Amino acid sequence: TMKVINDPIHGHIELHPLLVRIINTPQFQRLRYIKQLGGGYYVFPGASHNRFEHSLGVGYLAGCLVHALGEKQPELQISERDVLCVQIAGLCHDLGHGPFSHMFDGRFIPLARPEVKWTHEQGSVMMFEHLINSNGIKPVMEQYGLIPEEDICFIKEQIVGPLWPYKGRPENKSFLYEIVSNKRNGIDVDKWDYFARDCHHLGIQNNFDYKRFIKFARVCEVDNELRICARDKEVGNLYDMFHTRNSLHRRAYQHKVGNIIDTMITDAFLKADDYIEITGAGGKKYRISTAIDDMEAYTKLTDNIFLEILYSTDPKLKDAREILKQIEYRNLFKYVGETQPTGQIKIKREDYESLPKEVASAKPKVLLDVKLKAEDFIVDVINMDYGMQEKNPIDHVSFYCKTAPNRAIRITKNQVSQLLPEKFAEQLIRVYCKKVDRKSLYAARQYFVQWCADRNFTKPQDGDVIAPLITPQKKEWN
Amino acid sequence: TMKVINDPIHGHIELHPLLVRIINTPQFQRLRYIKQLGGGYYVFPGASHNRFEHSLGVGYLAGCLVHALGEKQPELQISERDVLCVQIAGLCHDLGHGPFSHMFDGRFIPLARPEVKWTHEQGSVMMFEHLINSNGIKPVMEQYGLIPEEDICFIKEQIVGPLLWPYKGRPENKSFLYEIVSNKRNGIDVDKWDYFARDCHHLGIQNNFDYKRFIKFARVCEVDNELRICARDKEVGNLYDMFHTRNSLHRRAYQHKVGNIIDTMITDAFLKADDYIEITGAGGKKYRISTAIDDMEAYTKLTDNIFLEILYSTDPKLKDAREILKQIEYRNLFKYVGETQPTGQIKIKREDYESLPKEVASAKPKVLLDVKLKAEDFIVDVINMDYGMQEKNPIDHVSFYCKTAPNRAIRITKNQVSQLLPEKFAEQLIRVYCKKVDRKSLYAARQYFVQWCADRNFTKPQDGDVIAPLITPQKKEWN
Amino acid sequence: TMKVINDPIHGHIELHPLLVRIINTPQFQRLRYIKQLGGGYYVFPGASHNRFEHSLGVGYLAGCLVHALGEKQPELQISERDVLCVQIAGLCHDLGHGPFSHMFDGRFIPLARPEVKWTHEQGSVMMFEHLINSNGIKPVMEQYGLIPEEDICFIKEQIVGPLWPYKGRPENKSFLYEIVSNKRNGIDVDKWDYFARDCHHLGIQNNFDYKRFIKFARVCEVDNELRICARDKEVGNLYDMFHTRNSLHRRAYQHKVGNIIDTMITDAFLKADDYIEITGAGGKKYRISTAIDDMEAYTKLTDNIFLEILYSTDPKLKDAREILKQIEYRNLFKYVGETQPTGQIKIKREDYESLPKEVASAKPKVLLDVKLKAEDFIVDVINMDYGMQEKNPIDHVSFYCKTAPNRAIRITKNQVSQLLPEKFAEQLIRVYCKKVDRKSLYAARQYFVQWCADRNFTKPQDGDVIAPLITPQKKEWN
C-alpha cells in the first residue's frame, strides 16, 4: 500500500511502494547531504534545504500533472505504467547533483576538467543506472507492470533529453516528455517545486500559482504531435512565471556574495583535488574531479567534503583549509561593482579568461599606493535569460479557447501588453578584488570604473561616489 | 492609555487615545459597510474585506515609517506631534470612498454628474472636516499637544495634495512627511503597502513585495534643496518589482473583465434609481444618490447598503433598477466579446468614450448579417494601465544613496539596471461586451467587434481566428 | 463542464453544474449578506467573512471526504449519485442562518418568540425546499441521475437529523450521514472549514490538520453498521481537535465584548420588531420574528436589517436606533467580571431570568452613592463543552490498527494520557452593567463580588483590586 510522508510545501503525500524502494537506497539518500542553493545558505540563513526534499516534491507534482490530464482526457490512453514512469523520472531527476549543487557543474568541473563536457543531468542518468543495478530494482519494476528495456530508456530521456528522436515512447505520447523537464518551452514541474520550496526557506514570497495552471491545461494536436496547451486567459500568468524566475535569480541565486562564496569554495576544492581520495568500484581511487566517472565513488561525494577539508590536519590540505577558514571569519573577496555591455554587443565565453588582465591594465589618472596584478581581480560573467537564450518562450507555447477546446493557437507578445520586456537575455559583469585592505580596495575601484569607461560599458550605480575623479571622463554619464 | 487591536495582516497594534476618539464616530465606522474591491467579491469570494480594516492598516504603517526615520535620524527633529498628524492622515485617507469604492468615483459620478470634477480624496477631506466638527475632536487634539489651525491643514494636504513651496501645514525642512501617506512625487506610499498585503490575503493570490525591507533601507537626504525619502541603491530592482506587482494585481484582480461588468451593471441600477431614492441630509433636506456628495451628513448614510435597498424594494418606480440587480443574482450578466488595444502612439481620449458603441454597431461586416444590433446593445470599457504617473517612469523620480556616502543622493536610470525592464509605462485595454445574451446575438456581436478592430487598426483579438474566421485573414498586419 | 472558483482557504476548486444552478439563486446568494461571526467583527476587524464562502468550503470538503472513501474502498458502492447528494448537503447546510448567524437563533428568536422551538438547521431544511421549488431545480437533479422523492429526504436528514431512523439511505450507507453534520461524535467537515476560515480572518493560527485525518480514515463494521473510523495513532490529534474548538470559543466566539455587542443588537431588534414589515408570499406582511415562518420573506432578511434601523427616520424606530448609535460611539454596557459555579453544581436554564435580581439584592458592606435595580444588570450564562454535553466524544469514535485494518476498537482516555481534561463541560457566568459612569460601575463591582461570595462561586480574578473591602469576607480566597 501507500506510505504517507509530510512535506511542508505539499502536505501529506502518498508514495507508491516502487517509489519507496528507490528512495531507500544509499544512492537516493545521498541527496540529504547536498544543499539545494549551495553557498546561498551563507547569505540566506533559512536556506538549509537539501535536494532530497526537492526530489520528493518534483516526483509528487509530476504525478499530479499526468493524473489530471488522464482524468479529463481518457482518450489519451495514459496507463498506470505511464504514470509511474513519470513519477520515477520526477523523483530521480536531480540524482546527479554534486556538492553545493550548481557550484559543482557551473564552476568546479569546468575549471578542474576542461577536457570533459559534463552536466548534473548526465550524472542523474548514470546514477539512476547504478541505483537500479546495485539494489535489485528491475524485478520490482516488472512486478508493477513496467517493461525495463523500454521504460528505463523513457525515464532517462525525460531527464536528459533524447523525424521523432525518442526510443521510449511514440509521437502520440509526446506530451509526457513535457512534464519533468520541458525542452520545448521550459514550463515544467521542477520549476514549480523549487519556486515554492526556495521561497518558503529564503524568506521571499512566491507569486506563481501552479495549481491554477494544472486546472486549465489540456492536450491538443499541434504540427501532428500531441502537446500540453493552456487556456488563452493564462497568457499573462505565463509571462509572470518567467518574471518570477528572473526575480529569484536576481535576489537570491546570483546574489553577489552568494556567488563569491561559491567561488571561494571552488578554489578550495581546486587546491585539494590532488590530495583527496575516494574509493570507488573494485577498490580504485578517485579524486573530487574524477569521482564523476565512477558512480560508486560519486555516491560518497557530498557537501561533507567541505568539512573533511576544514577539519583536516594533513599539511597537503593547508592551502584549501586556509580558504575555508577565511569564509568562517567572514574575510571574503571584496565586491567592487557591476556593469553591463551596451549596443547589442556580447561577451564570448573564449574571452572570459582575459578580463582580469584588462582590468589590471586600465591606466586610471594615477593617485595610487599599490599597483594591482591580474591575479588579484575576479570577473564573473552571468548570463540571465528566460531559459531559451534570447528567445521568448511564450512563442513556443500553444493555447486553446473556451469556444474550440481541441484547437491550438498562438498568441504573440503584441496581443498581450506593451509593458512586457523587449529583450529576453542580458549579461551582468561583476568584479571583485582579493586584496581586502582599504588601500587595495580604493585602487580596485579606480581600475574598475576606468575599465567600464574604456569598453563603453554601463556606468556603475555608485560610480560618482566610489570614483569621483573618473566618472567626469565621460560626457555620456552626467 | 493605548488600546490594542488585532489585525490579521499587521498583528497586534497600538492605537493612541486620540485615534480611538476619531475611530469611534459614525463618520469613521461607515467604512465597515463599503467593500474595498466592490464588485470584485462577486468573482473572488474571499474578497469581503471593507475599507475600515484597510484604513487602520494605512494609519499603522504611516506611523511605522515616520518613527523609523525618527530613530535613525534625530537631526530631522520629528516630534510626537508630527507622528500623530501622520497617523491621523493614514487613518482618514479613504473616508470619502462611496459605495463599492472605485465604482463610485470611477463610473457612477462621471455618468450621473458630468458637470462636476470629483474624487474620493476630495470626499475624504470634507468628511474629515465633518467628523472633527460634529464630534468635538478639536479640544482633544489640543489636549495631546496638537495645534488645530496648522495641523488640520497638514492632515488634509497629506491626503489630497496642495490646496516656490505650495504647503501651508509644514515647511520645506519637513517635506519628507508628505511622502508617507500619498506620495505625489513617485507614488511609493504606505497605502499601496497595506492594500498589496491585504488584498492578497483575501483574494488568494500571493504577494511578492516586502515593505519592511524597504523601511530598513530608507533614509532622508537633501535633493534640490528639499529633504526627501531616499532608498539604498541596491533596492532599485525591488522598486521596479513593486510597480510590476501593482500592475499584476490590476490584470488578475481589480480589472477582471467580469468584475468590471458587475461594477457596470451596479452603476446602471444606481442610475435608474437615482430619481426615486431620497437620503436625508443636514437641516432635513433630501438628497439623491448622485447629490449626497454635496452634504456630508447625507453622505455618511451612503454605503453598500443601497444595493440591498434597491434589491429588496417594492416601489413600482424602482422595478427597472431592481430587475438589473436580479439579473446579477441569477448570474445573467452581459457577455464578454473580447479585448483589443490601440497601436503606434495612438491614444483614445476620454471625450470619445461615449461614441464607441455606435462605432461598433456601424461596422459593415462583409455582407453577412441576419439580425442588426443597435448601439444601446454594446458596452465598450476603456482601461488605462500604467505605473501611476501616466507615461513616465516613476523610478526616474526616486533618489538613492550608497553605503560609502550615506548623505548624498543620486539617480539611477533604467539602462544601469537591466535590459529586461518594460520599454513603455502606459497602455490602454479596450473590452467589448454585449447585453443581448442569446447565441444569435452573440455570434453577430463577435463579427461587428472583430471588424471594428480591423477597421481602426487595433490589435488582433486572441481568439480572433476562432470567433471570426471569415474576417481575420482580410488583414495584412495580422498574418 | 466544471466551473472553477478561487477560494483563499481551499484554492482553485471545481463546481459541478448542478451545484452552480443551486448557487445562482436569490436563496443561496443571500448568504453573501450574513457575517459568519456576527458581532465578532466589532472586536476582530479582519472578521468580515460571510456564510456564502463558508458554504462553498463545506460543500467542497464534503466531496473530498466521500471521494476518498470511495477510491480506497470500491466495495462500499459509493455512486456518483451519493457523492452529489453529499456535496449538495454540504453546500446548503447553513441556508437557514439569519442575521448575525448564531445571534439570531441563540439570542433573538428565544427572546422574541418563546412559543416556538427553532434552529438555523430547521431553517436550512425549509429554505432548501423553497429554493428547489421556486427555481426549477428538480428536473436538473434528475438530469444527473438523482431521484427526488428519496434524495431530497437524504439531503435534509444529513443537515438536520432524522432500529434505523432514516428514510433516505439504508444501514449499509450510514457512514454518509457522518460527513456534513456528525451526530455520533461531532467530527465533521463543517468544523474543518470554519476552523481554517475563521483563523485566516481572525488573526489566530490554526493547529488542526484535516488533510491528514482524511488520509487515515476508513469505513469499518461497528455494531452491524458501517462507520467512519480513524487510525489508532490519530487519537492524540482528535483530542487536540476538540481542544482547538474550545480555544476558538474562548478567544473569539465568546469574547466578552463580542457577546455584549450581540446582546445590544438583539435588544435593538426587539425594539423594532413591532414596526418593521417584510413582504412575503401572497403579499402578506411579516416581522423580523415571524419571517422565519415564510421562506419568501426570510429570503430578504439579512444583516442589512441593522443598517435599515440605523439609517431610519421613522419615529417608531428611535428606540432601536439609539441602541445602534450607542454601539457606533462605543458606549457599550460595561463588563463587570466572570465567575463559575463550584462543587459539581449547575445553573438550570429556568433560573436564568432571576439572576439579575439576585445581584441587585446583594447587600455589600455599604459605601454607595447609587443603589442599582435589576433592570441595570445582565447575566450571560455560557455552556462550554466538547459538543456532547458532558460526554467525552472520543468515547464515541472507533479506531483501526495497521495489523487488522477491518476491525474496529475503542481507545479510552487512560490509554492515552494523564494530561487530558478530567471534565468535558463547564459554565461561565458574565455580568455586565448598563449604567456606564464611574460611580455606577464602582458599585456594580461590589454587588457582583458580594454575589459570588454569597453563592459560593469562584473568586473573580481581579477581585482584590476591584473590591478590596469584600474579598476578605472569605477565608477560602487568600
Add this chain to the structure above:
Amino acid sequence: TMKVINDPIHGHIELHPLLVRIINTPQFQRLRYIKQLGGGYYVFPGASHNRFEHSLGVGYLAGCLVHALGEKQPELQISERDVLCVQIAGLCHDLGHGPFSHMFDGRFIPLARPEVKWTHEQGSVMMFEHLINSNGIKPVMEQYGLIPEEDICFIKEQIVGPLLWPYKGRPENKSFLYEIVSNKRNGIDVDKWDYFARDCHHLGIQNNFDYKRFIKFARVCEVDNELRICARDKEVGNLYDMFHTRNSLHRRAYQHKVGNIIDTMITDAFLKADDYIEITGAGGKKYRISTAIDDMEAYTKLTDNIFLEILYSTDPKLKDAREILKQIEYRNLFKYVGETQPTGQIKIKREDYESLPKEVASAKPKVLLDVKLKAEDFIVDVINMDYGMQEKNPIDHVSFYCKTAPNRAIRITKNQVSQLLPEKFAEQLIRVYCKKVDRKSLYAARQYFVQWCADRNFTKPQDGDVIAPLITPQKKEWN
C-alpha cells in the same frame, strides 16, 4: 553600523557590530552543522534547519522583549549595556549543543560517560569562554561600553543559571533580566518562542501561540521584594495554551517513536566507533567522541559530520558502527512493539532504566513460545513528558496584573480559570522496540511485551486485543 540579515521566521533583523564579531567565529559558525531536531529529519523531511538560525532568532527575540520593557517603563533604568548583554546571551545560549542536538546530551553522553553529569547548557558556558578568549572579543566589548569582569558573568548566568540573592552579574533591581533567555522560575522564555515558530515552519505543523501578543501585555512588577516580568490577567488562558502547544509538539514531532529510534541507532553507532575515532584538540592531544566535551578546541570540530565520517569510512575497526548506519539508509530499523504507561502515583526511577529489557525478556508467556528472545534484543525507552517543572503547575509560578491597578501583582489559580485544564502536569511514556525484525521474532516480542504490561500493572496497549488476543482477557483491570 548595523548589518541586516533576512530570516524567514522573523524577517529583516539588525545585528549590532559586536554581535557580528561574535557570529563570525569558527565557534559560532559550527552551529551551521548541527540539526535542531536531530533524527527528526529522517521522519519529517522539511526539518533540515540547524542550530545557527535558531540562535540568531533567540538573540533577536531577547532584544525585542528587553527593549519593549524599556520603552514602556523608563523607571527600570535598562541601559544599552543591559540590552546588548541580553542579546549576546540569546545568541550564544545553545553554543554547547553537540551532534544531533538533544540526542547528544539526552542519550550518548549518559551511556558513554556515566561518571559525569553534563548538559548542553554547561557546554555553552565553556564554548562561550573559548570563543571570547580565542578571538579577541574582550576589547571589542569595552569598545561598546561593556565591562567584561561583570558582563561575562552576567551572560553566563542567563544561559546556565546561578554559578539570599545568588547572582554576581546583576543585583535584585535587575532580576527581570534573567527571565528573558532561560526562565528558571516558570519556563516562559524567548527560546521557546523561537523554536515553536521555527520548528512549525519546517515540520509542516502549524503553531497556535502568539508571542507578540504576550509582549504587548507584559510588565515588570514588584513581587516578594524582587522585580519580575508579569502578564495581564486576561492572558492566563493563553499561557495554559502555550504549555499545551509545547506538549503537542513533543507528541507529534520531537518524541515520534521512529524519530527516537533513529536517535537510538545513531547513538549505538557512535558507541561502537568511540574507541577508534580521534579528534585533535588543544596542544595536539587526541580526544574521542565521548571526551571531546572536555576540550573546547576539539569540541569545535565535533558536529553532525561525524555520522558521515563513519558511514564513508573503510577502516575495518569501524565496520560495526558503519553497518548500523547502513541499516538506517536501507530503512531496516528496529521495530516498534508498542507503548504503555505506569499507574496510580507509581514512577520509574532513572537508575532502573537499564534493567527493563531483562524484565521484558523474562516475561513468562502462558506456555506458548517456539523461540526465546534475549535482553540484548529489546529496547525500552522511558520518556518524561511534563510542563517543564516536573510535577508542578508553572502557571502557579506566574504573576499577573489588572487594568485598574497596573503596578500590583496577583496570582490566579487553576480553578479560577477552567474545569477543562489538566488534572496532572507530568507523566511517563514507555516504548518497546525489537532489534530482530522477522515475523516470528516480532510476534513473540508482542507477547513478552503485553505480558510485561499485565505483570507490572501498566496501561493496556491500544492495539493489545489485536497483537495479543490470548493475553488481554486475563486482566480484570482491562475488561
